[PDB]
Amino acid sequence: NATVDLEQKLEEKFGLEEAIVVATHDMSEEEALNFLAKEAAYTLSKRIAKVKTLGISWGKTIRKFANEFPFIPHKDLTIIPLIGGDLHSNQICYDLKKKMKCHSKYLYAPALVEDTEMKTDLSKNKYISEVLEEGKTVDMAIVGVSSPYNHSTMEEIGYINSEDIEELRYKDVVGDINSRFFTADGKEAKTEINTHVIGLSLEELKNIPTVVALANGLQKKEALVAALNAGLIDVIVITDRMAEYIL
Numbered sequence: 001n002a003t004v005d006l007e008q009k010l011e012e013k014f015g016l017e018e019a020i021v022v023a024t025h026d027m028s029e030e031e032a033l034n035f036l037a038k039e040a041a042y043t044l045s046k047r048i049a050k051v052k053t054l055g056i057s058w059g060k061t062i063r064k065f066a067n068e069f070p071f072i073p074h075k076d077l078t079i080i081p082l083i084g085g086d087l088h089s090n091q092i093c094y095d096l097k098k099k100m101k102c103h104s105k106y107l108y109a110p111a112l113v114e115d116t117e118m119k120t121d122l123s124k125n126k127y128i129s130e131v132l133e134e135g136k137t138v139d140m141a142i143v144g145v146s147s148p149y150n151h152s153t154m155e156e157i158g159y160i161n162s163e164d165i166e167e168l169r170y171k172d173v174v175g176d177i178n179s180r181f182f183t184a185d186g187k188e189a190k191t192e193i194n195t196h197v198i199g200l201s202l203e204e205l206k207n208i209p210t211v212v213a214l215a216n217g218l219q220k221k222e223a224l225v226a227a228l229n230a231g232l233i234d235v236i237v238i239t240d241r242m243a244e245y246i247l
Contacts, residue, residue, distance in 0.1 A: 175223025186230020
């Protein structure tokens with residue numbers, strides 16, 4: 001297979017556990033994203049069958065994954081949101097829980113609290129703290145990778161504004177995973193936003209045994225490549241078009 005060929009090449013290049021590459025015939029970026037979601041759901045349902053605990057992030061790509069996810073029971077699973085706040089981790093986790101008839105936890109908190117004192121009180125409430133600690137110990141996690149630039153989801157939803165974007169640029173940010181903004185070396189930038197997010201940090205993510213990332217769109221190359229080089233990701237699910245571009 002050219003496909004198996006690309007998967008091998010990606011595993012060798014980035015030191016991945018696995019690369020799942022999806023063959024796009026003649027699809028737009030948008031049509032490829034839906035197909036990637038569908039195939040991710042199919043293939044990843046098999047891995048998820050094997051784990052006890054599953055952490056989920058947020059966003060459009062993960063929302064699509066969840067919509068495509070099959071109705072196979074896994075009643076002993078516990079699903080944990082990795083970030084506070086339709087596209088929200090809590091609602092995604094609940095929808096997956098309904099499909100698997102399993103357990104889930106709710107992160108009773110906003111994703112981004114600019115008020116430092118409030119952020120601090122919430123981070124220390126006991127049900128919030130317990131769900132955060134459960135996130136840190138999941139067997140596997142599914143995340144998206146995004147770029148805060150060129151009119152992204154977070155900006156279009158009013159999560160970050162243009163002044164936050166200029167701060168990120170000034171700080172040489174290249175991408176985000178689980179609303180943590182990282183530089184080219186894959187480390188969280190020293191920036192206010194990163195210290196005000198309620199959810200799993202990049203260093204916490206790096207300690208999860210299997211982190212799966214779903215990404216599409218060539219504008220995310222820089223973000224993805226940096227994440228992959230930093231070892232934040234163990235398994236990628238991407239299109240063959242994206243694979244060619246990042247190889």
